């Protein structure tokens, strides 16, 4: 109800994921990457 | 791109003082950062390496912490041949970047 | 004792290019990637660019499109061709191998004493 702010996703990268690859950066994006 | 800052960009300290030389990364970079000594006319030395490893042959007097985004670079007690530029450099991906340089 | 020596170094026109060379011996270079790292008068490190061991994979800085790193393991040389060079490219280039212990897998730091550039 008060909202679920435990799960989280990258909006922010300086370019795209190969095949199950896995990044839990926190690089400010030119921005923190992650909402 | 990681962008690589230091803080304070020049310090005045005399021999026998403590130094201590803060770098920040843009992005977070875990414990995959270098840091160099740089005197006039001479190519770059490294002193650290994975954040705070010691490289053979430095002294004693050098140390260095950290981890993610916030790092700390420490002269213990300055001497008269510690007079240089440090940079700080990250190389947990490409492009690798260097910072700024602070001026002791 | 570990050495790396660049040459090629000189005055160019803008729009012009240079080619630079970095020789290397004391150390098995053909097993290493290395780096172009360059420095302005009154500036900074930049880095410019790297190449793998095997000449395969590359990486650019400011450069890429107009700069082009290549090696050759016969000759234990590294070269960088310039094309389409600025005034903002004035700086001394050095060739160096970088200790890194994500990508080239390097547990020692070299440098050479780097070559000027002059745009003009």
């Known amino acids: 109800v008060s909202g679920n702010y435990n799960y989280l996703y990258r909006l922010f990268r300086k370019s795209n994921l190969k095949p199950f690859e896995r990044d839990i950066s926190t690089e400010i994006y030119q921005y923190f990457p992650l909402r | 791109v990681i962008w690589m800052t230091q803080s304070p960009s020049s310090l005045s300290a005399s021999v026998g003082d403590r130094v201590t030389i803060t770098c920040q990364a843009s992005?977070?970079?875990?414990?995959?950062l270098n840091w160099y000594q740089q005197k006039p006319g001479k190519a770059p030395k490294l002193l650290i390496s994975?954040?705070?490893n010691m490289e053979t042959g430095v002294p004693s007097r050098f140390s260095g912490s950290g981890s993610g985004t916030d790092f700390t670079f420490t002269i213990s007690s300055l001497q008269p041949e510690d007079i240089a530029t440090y940079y700080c450099?990250?190389?947990?991906?490409?492009?690798?970047?260097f910072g700024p340089g602070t001026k002791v | 004792e570990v050495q790396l020596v660049e040459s090629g170094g000189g005055v160019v026109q803008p729009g012009g290019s240079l080619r630079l060379s970095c020789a290397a011996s004391?150390?098995?270079?053909?097993?290493?990637?290395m780096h172009w790292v360059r420095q302005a008068p009154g500036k900074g490190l930049e880095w410019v660019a790297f190449?793998?061991?095997?000449?395969?994979?590359?990486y650019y800085a400011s450069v890429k499109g107009r700069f082009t790193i290549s090696r050759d393991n016969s000759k234990n040389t590294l070269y960088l061709q310039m094309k389409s060079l600025r005034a903002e490219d004035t700086a001394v280039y050095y060739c160096?191998?970088?200790?890194?212990?994500?990508?080239?897998?390097?547990?020692?730091?070299?440098w050479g004493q780097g070559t000027l550039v002059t745009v003009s």
């Open positions: 992005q977070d970079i875990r414990f995959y």
């Open positions: 190449i793998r061991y095997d000449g395969g994979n590359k």
């Open positions: 450099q990250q190389y947990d991906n490409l492009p690798f970047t």
């Open positions: 160096a191998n970088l200790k890194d212990s994500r990508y080239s897998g390097s547990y020692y730091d070299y």
């Open positions: 004391g150390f098995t270079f053909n097993s290493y990637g």
């Open positions: 994975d954040a705070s």
